[PDB]
Amino acid sequence: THINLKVSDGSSEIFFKIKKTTPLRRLMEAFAKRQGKEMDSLRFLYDGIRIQADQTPEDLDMEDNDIIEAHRGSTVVTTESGLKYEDLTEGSGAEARAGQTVSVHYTGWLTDGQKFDSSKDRNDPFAFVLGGGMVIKGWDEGVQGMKVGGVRRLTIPPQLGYGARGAGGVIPPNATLVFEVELLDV
């Protein structure tokens, strides 16, 4: 009667138990609500083809514990330091440049989807001197060339992050870090 289903974001994996007779829109909206994002902004796949919210698990021949991929073209850049970045939204305002004090909103996750900090929780934009060594090296390099309005996803290897020691209580040794950085002002 019921089925268990895993929805994967490439990092986080959330399990859902729904009735096979139900259309998957409630699963989609529920997975989208946790991310605090609208459902329109995410495309769900199952065995390749995109899921329309009108379809049901039975209508798609889903077995217990099958997986659904979740996604937002996409252009992931790898720089000479190992930094990876992807511009989710291209800004059209001014360009962030070393020496400026730039203001941002951000969320930071471990590569298992676990969120460890966010300026949005206190609804308090974060400012810093770009390239001045106030922040982990992955930010000083990753936020240069953003434009006001932009959302950039930074994937920071540990030596551009907190290294072999990590950060007390929260960030393990050798952790790769993922940040969505929104540039507010330069």
DSSP notation for 37-102: --GGG-EEEETTEEPPTT--TGGGTPPTT-EEEEE----EEE-TTS-EEEEEE---SPBP-TTSEE
Pick between residue 91 and residue 108 the one whose CB is nearest to ligand 6UO: 108
- Give, as ranges, the residues between 126 and 145 that touch ligand 6UO (CB under 6 A): 126, 135-136, 139
Tell me the sheet residues that pair with 69: 8, 45
Based on the residue annotation, tell me whether 126 is a catalytic residue of this protein.
Answer: no
Which of 3, 51, 68, 136 is catalytic? The answer is 136
Interface with ligand 6UO, residue 85, by CB under 6 A: no
Which of 9, 66, 87, 117 is catalytic? The answer is 117
Q: Is 157 annotated as a binding residue?
A: no
Cβ within 8 Å of residue 48, ≥6 positions away: none
CB of residue 122 vs Mg ion: minimum separation in angstroms?
Answer: 8
Residue with the shortest CB distance to Mg ion: 124
Cα→Cα distances 145→93, 97, 175, Å: 11, 6, 25
- Considering only 117, 149, 153, 176, the residue that binds ligand 6UO (CB under 6 A) is 117
SS3 state of residue 163 = coil
Q: Are 127 and 96 in contact (CB under 8 A)?
A: no
Q: Are 130 and 143 in contact (CB under 8 A)?
A: yes
| Catalytic sites, residue numbers | 106, 116-117, 136, 162, 179
Annotated binding site for Mg(2+): 124-125
Q: By the criterion CB under 6 A, which residues form the site for ligand 6UO? A: 106, 108, 116-117, 126, 135-136, 139, 167, 170-171
Annotated binding site: 124-125, 185-186
